Amino acid sequence: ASEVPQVVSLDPTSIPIEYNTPIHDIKVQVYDIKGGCNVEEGLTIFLVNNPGKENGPVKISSKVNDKQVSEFLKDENMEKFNVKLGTSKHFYMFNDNKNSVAVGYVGCGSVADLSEADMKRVVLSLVTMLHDNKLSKLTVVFEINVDKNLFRFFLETLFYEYMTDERFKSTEYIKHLGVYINNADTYKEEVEKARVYYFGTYYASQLIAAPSNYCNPVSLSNAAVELAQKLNLEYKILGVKELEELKMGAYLSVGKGSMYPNKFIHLTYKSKGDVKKKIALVGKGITFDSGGYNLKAAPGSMIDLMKFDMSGCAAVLGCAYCVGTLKPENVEIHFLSAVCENMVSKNSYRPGDIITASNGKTIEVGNTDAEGRLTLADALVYAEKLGVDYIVDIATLTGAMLYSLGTSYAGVFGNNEELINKILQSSKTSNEPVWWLPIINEYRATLNSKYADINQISSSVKASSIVASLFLKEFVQNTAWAHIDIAGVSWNFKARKPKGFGVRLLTEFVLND
């Protein structure tokens, strides 16, 4: 743990982290829907749909072991409500025991099989009722058909959206969660995995949402060490002197103008078994992206959001938590992130500057706002030197992603078809949508520099996301490598918060590989 430099004494010297969350205190019980539902404590919500008849009427099929509630759920009463996706109703009443109970439903549409996005809308409608009720217990009745992964996705999304971050606020939660579903015994094992995936995601969220004055290269690296100590992971934080020795000139150049020294994070998980596959997970770690002398001054550049430019690193650390907690066998994982800050100063690097990477490749900087690939370049070189089987990087690299896949799907690039398929597979089971994008070699010529070995950016080609991958590919000589661009999906613009995107995706990759 290094000392965080300050300009004034009022400047924060560490990132506030909540480990023990209210979600961890929620007792979850899963019952089989065939046995009938009990209504007694808290709020009970039925998940109902109407296949074929769009915005159809609500009909409750499950038998409820309560007379008062049963009269409420009769067809005559419920038919006045419709199943439009997201729609919800809930009433307060007394049960057979004169106890105050709340009953309601959430519309699941006319489609039998809910998608990842659809299920998200259901949870938000559900969470809205939770934020307006001081309940002791929530009961969810699944009168819709969902698989093991989607059920777990339900819980994760529920836990994540339910949780509210109040670390910077200052000027309750349910204690029980009951679930009625079919084949309850088979879904039971998904519960505690959901809790872990939940915190891994929320942990990353805490890092991303944390402002750049709290979350800087020093404080973020200190947090990584703390996380490694709580899990029992080998850790190593490389400073400037060590980074200089390793000749990481690309990575060092971006952070030259910062008051915070560069910090290279190296976390390692080794299984207490014969290692088989070795994996390096590399996350982009820019604590703040001002754009450098290529300042983000253009309209739509969203400079106030650029605290999230370390979303990739956050995802990797979140993955580190899940892996360190679940403790997979036959695997050795290295969690890497070259963390720094891209600022404007007399010491900042300039447009046109030519710099040398640790692999000897000289680079002509055409735009200081393309700092991510520069840091990733030296990180990718370091990763391959570890002698790993798979290298997967995750980063908020290109804004063009907003124009390609938008805010829902992340983009994946790579030099190996099999590794890419694993990521796509990991996307399906994690329910974090990802689409395969091509590395078009025909554009490679645009990176031919007149003076340097290679250009940082293209002057003509507008396929910025593809061009960047072409850049990165020049720093992986002989290793299976994939690149996930999460620039468009990292931030939830409507909800005004991070998604912690990539944590569950990477964990599924580590577990299923």
Ligand X SMILES: CC(C)(C)OC(=O)N[C@H](C(=O)NO)c1ccc(-n2cccn2)cc1
Biggest CA-to-CA distance, the chain: 84
Give residue number: closest CB to ligand X: 399
Residue 296 marked ligand-binding: yes
Q: Which residue(s) pair with 269 in the sheet?
A: 333
Helix (H, G, I), strand (E, B) or coil at 466: helix
Write down the least CB distance from residue 345 to a second copy, Å: 4
- Shortest spacing between CB 306 and ligand X, in angstroms: 7
Q: Which does 52 bind (CB under 5 to 8 A by kind): a second copy, Zn ion, ligand X, none?
A: none
Q: Which of 247, 278, 296, 361 is catalytic?
A: 296
How many C-beta atoms lie closer than 10 Å to residue 65's C-beta? 14
Strand ranges for 49-204 from DSSP E: 88-94, 100-107, 137-142, 176-181
Nearer to ligand X, 152 or 444 (CB): 444
Q: 141 or 286: whose CB is closer to Zn ion? A: 286
Q: What share of the chain is helix, strand, coil (3-state, %, to 5)?
A: 35, 20, 45
Q: Could you tell me if 271 and 19 are in contact, meaning their C-beta atoms sit under 8 angstroms apart?
A: no
β-strand partners of 410: 434
Residue 487 interacting entry, from a second copy, ligand X, Zn ion, none, C-beta within 5 to 8 Å by type: ligand X
Least distance in angstroms from the C-beta of 175 to ligand X:
38
Strands 100-107 and 88-94: antiparallel
- For residue 428, list its beta bridge partners: none
Q: How far apart are CA 339 and CA 334, in angstroms?
A: 15
User: 371 a known binding residue?
Assistant: yes
Q: Which is nearer to a second copy, 178 or 488 (CB)?
A: 488
Q: Pick the catalytic residue: 152, 195, 307, 373?
A: 373
Cβ-based burial of 430 (10 A; exposed 0-12, middle 13-18, buried ≥19): buried
Residue 276 CA neighbour count, 13 Å, CB half: 8
Q: Are 84 and 107 in contact (CB under 8 A)?
A: yes
Q: Is 309 annotated as a binding residue?
A: yes
Say whether 245 sits in a helix, a strand or coil. helix
The residue ranges that bind ligand X (CB under 6 A) are 289, 291, 302, 367, 369-372, 396-400, 402, 457, 464, 487-488
Give ∠ CA 11-16-21 in degrees, rounded to 5: 160
Which among ligand X, a second copy, Zn ion, none contacts residue 272 (Cβ within 5 to 8 A by kind)? none
34 labeled part of a ligand binding site = no
State yes or no: 306 annotated in a binding site: yes
Residue 243 beta carbon to a second copy: minimum distance, rounded to whole angstroms: 8
For residue 428, indicate whether it is catalytic: no
Instruction: Give whichever of 53 and 270 is closer to a second copy, judged by the CB atom.
Output: 53
Please say if 247 is a catalytic residue: no
Q: How far is the CB of 303 from a second copy (least distance, A)?
A: 5
| Positions that interact with Zn ion (CB under 5 A) | 286, 289, 309, 369, 371-372
Task: Give 342's strand partners.
Answer: 289
Choice between 300 and 387, CB closer to ligand X: 300
Q: Report the C-alpha gap between 423 and 136 in whole angstroms.
A: 40
In the annotated binding site, the residues are 284, 289, 296, 304, 306, 309, 369, 371
List the catalytic residues: 296, 373
In the annotated binding site for Zn(2+), the residues are 284, 289, 304, 306, 309, 369, 371
In the annotated binding site for a peptide, the residues are 284, 289, 296, 309, 369
